[PDB]
Design a protein around this ligand. Structure first.
Ligand code: ATP
Ligand code: ATP
Ligand code: ATP
Ligand code: ATP
Ligand code: ATP
Ligand code: NA
Ligand code: NA
Ligand code: NA
Lengths: 199, 215, 202, 215, 215
């Protein structure tokens, strides 16, 4: 697979370094000369180009890339003009980083295959950890069930699994323990909060 | 639990909106008047202040907040000077949003309780989804064992759980399966996996990768 | 009929002044303070607002306007964001001034009812006048047939065999409408190729 | 001894010229092309570089220098990220020119071996000369003891050393007398004090104030 | 004694904070609104005025000040036009902070009473500390004689004053010893010197250098 990442910011620069670490052909495009020089070593091909121009986009052979990631999320004009061109060039998969709710609505009309909010998805994830310090990481299977990696408190010390009645009393299934030790649990959103309060 | 969020960007503004939804007293501090007027309705109180000033920081009653989040990740001077003042004010928890690796090193020195890379962590998470399109959302329990929410392929249709030897060969456990928008926790042998449905699995990282090829 | 004109430039300010002359209520919105003060006298209601904000758009009572004209044609971000709000606010008629081909393609996606190129339409109209210095002003009824207002050069109507030889009809003589044989700006209606032959031979 | 001076301002450019005058190997680093061309004659080697970037720091050959002076004192971000790289490069002695009190607090955290306030230390010395027109130059041995180079008034003219009972009444010992451009180290009783000759007098900080007032 | 400080920089702001600490009436004039608000508490009278204007300078009542310090050292146009006005208004004492050699020459022509180089005089003083790590502070009595506040080494540990033939061989006099936060004036034979204590010495400039190499 060949990937193109347009815009080497904090978000796009992470995708170039990660996909290059896994051993993939990454094209790194950025309008900034100093950004491309820094990520020149972290990409298979790095070009100092403006992606809002169709002539520059055809010069890169952008039609040969199955996945194009437009990591521009502070310039709505540059981001929407780029993903309109890539939809014109018949790119199978265009993934765009959005800025606000209105930028999400423009890109949904002009044909973005997946629209990503990196700071909004992390900020909600961080604020869940701020509100309840017991949690460390979670994944939402649905809107009401989650796999919350809880942190064992002082009252859970020296307590066996059979002593815990999470299976029946709370209806929560413990998955793993990482030796205060990390306690991975699964259950309803309201049911897990009962186990956090009562230990 | 009273939270102060300094800098209402895409990251700071999301924490103010999320914590206000959960019903928490959030103080929204920003130096830009237009940003403050946007988050007046999404915060308990929104004020205009330059957090690099100690006199302006004490005019907010910032010593009364258990958590302060400095969500400035494009100005290193503004971000590092702010957490220095909060470190002096004996704030128990200071969480800072970092910009690069060398910005993370400054905050570690001057006493940031937690340092957050929002785009770097999401960019790494996205890049796993580009590389392996089977996955939908993964959470790393450790460096070798992870929970991967997989998407069922075309050959997984009309297949039973006992047919898939995940417990025996791959050494992985299917923790949940969802079909048609309804999620079933801890499926029992045997259940029908459909053409396009999410398949949550748990196991070693290299063991799931072998299973995705043969799924 | 209540009209809203968003963006007081050369194009938007001309729509405000013409509609205020005709006796219509016009709301003039612009982000520039100097523009609004100049067109405060030429608009029924004038405000200094950013039209890309949904809160500022609702303060104007923009839902009461049947026609909104987004005459922003150099800021693509301001033009595309504004028409998405007005589409969200259910304006029956949104007319947008575009900049280039790609700006036109964006506004077609997000639901612009009519997209206007003022400089491109005039530039095509002007460039037809430079190549053929006899013409003055023309409109295209169709691709093949057009009404061309020629300039009279160095004869009776019957002498000008446009009806038989060229297959064209003389429409006016400049003031005297509906000419008839015979009579010694010349308006001629006919096929586009036929008028060019008439100009070369006459 | 090898020295590197990062930032050729009024303060950094003075260290380059004084160390080169003494015959030391000075590397002059700056980001401005005009500054580097100006100090080509006053430094062993002058390089155009941006010190906040670590790749440009290792090209200079910065690990070969025992002393590095970061004489940037108007950009807090550029100064603190430079001394972070040098501290990470195991540079033994890093001397940093600071700007304000909060900049001093950051450099203390991230490992600056010595933090310098050139204008603040000179402003304090000047304000002692404005407040007291008798003094010319002083050195604080401690917070209560000092050596003050006084200036002779009219009442000290034609006065011998033994006539002045400074040793008993004030408890201050006269160290030297700058006689008409010629010094006199440890003057012996008695030497005639002229109209205007410097009187290097050592004593308590409060006691010399009495000597200035009582003449 | 009323002092006017024109330009509240790092150097001008240090004179305001020190003259007010000593109990003097200070007029703090600056063209920047942010600077005046910060120093409004540390100055008797703080004004946001431009000093290059003759009308604004007479609104301050600047003729009532014996000392005016023009602490603008990065703006030659503002510094030379200010002191041209103050000399035109017959200020008895005008002290100007200069930038380079050419600014020093202009201010001499247009009648500056004392011209100050804060960063240049510190850079020369700092470069002496980099060259010789034994010195901590020194005061130049002349171009050939100096008082150096040395630092004790391992070879100077447990050595009495009479053991050091500084009076006979080196021709230098030991003035005081800073014994770990305690300072003793005019030591008598004999006093023991610890491992690391400041040793204030006086002598010829070349004779002190021979002492450090030979002891
Ligand atoms: N037209 C363009 N074509 C290509 N790259 C561009 C273009 N416009 C901007 N960029 C580059 O894209 C990069 C990321 O965009 P930008 O800084 O606007 O986004 P952002 O919202 O700040 O994202 P991040 O949080 O990842 O930094 C920048 O380095 C910028 O120079
Ligand atoms: N000194 C300051 N005090 C308070 N708020 C500030 C200060 N400096 C910047 N801000 C605000 O912080 C917010 C976010 O800062 P900035 O835009 O520099 O960071 P970012 O990392 O690019 O943003 P984001 O969180 O959107 O990714 C902005 O609204 C900005 O106005
Ligand atoms: N967000 C906005 N909301 C309202 N008015 C705006 C906005 N952005 C720009 N304007 C105003 O719209 C007017 C026209 O926009 P602009 O000058 O960018 O377009 P243009 O193509 O040059 O227009 P014209 O050819 O009519 O002069 C200007 O007066 C500008 O100040
Ligand atoms: N990142 C950098 N790397 C190297 N040199 C730099 C860098 N940033 C600034 N400089 C240079 O450092 C020199 C001094 O810095 P600056 O002028 O900001 O400090 P300052 O406190 O005003 O100094 P001074 O008052 O002694 O002149 C300038 O010549 C400037 O060009
Ligand atoms: N014409 C003026 N009148 C009054 N104040 C002025 C004028 N011009 C500049 N200043 C102020 O004087 C102060 C010092 O000026 P400047 O920054 O040019 O000098 P500097 O040599 O860099 O100062 P320092 O090294 O002491 O920080 C600043 O606060 C500046 O705003
Ligand atoms: Na961002
Ligand atoms: Na135009
Ligand atoms: Na300075």
């Amino acid at each position: 697979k060949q990937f193109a990442v347009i815009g080497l910011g904090r978000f796009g620069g992470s995708i170039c370094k990660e996909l290059h670490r896994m051993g993939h052909e990454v094209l790194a495009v950025d309008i900034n000369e100093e950004k491309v020089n820094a990520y020149a070593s972290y990409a298979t091909h790095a070009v100092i180009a403006n992606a809002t121009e169709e002539n520059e986009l055809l010069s890169l052979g952008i039609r040969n890339f199955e996945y194009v990631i437009v990591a521009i999320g502070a310039n709505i004009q540059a981001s929407t003009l780029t993903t309109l061109l890539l939809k014109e060039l018949d790119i199978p998969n265009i993934w765009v980083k959005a800025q606000n709710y209105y930028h999400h609505k423009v890109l949904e009309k002009i044909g973005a295959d997946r629209i990503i909010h990196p700071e909004k998805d992390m900020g909600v994830k961080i604020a869940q950890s701020l509100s309840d310090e017991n949690v460390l990481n979670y994944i939402d299977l649905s809107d009401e069930y989650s796999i919350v990696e809880l942190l064992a408190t002082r009252k859970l010390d020296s307590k066996s699994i059979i002593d815990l009645n999470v299976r029946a009393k709370y209806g929560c299934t413990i998955l793993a323990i990482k030796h205060q030790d990390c306690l991975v649990i699964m259950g309803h959103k309201k049911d897990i909060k009962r186990f956090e309060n009562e230990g």
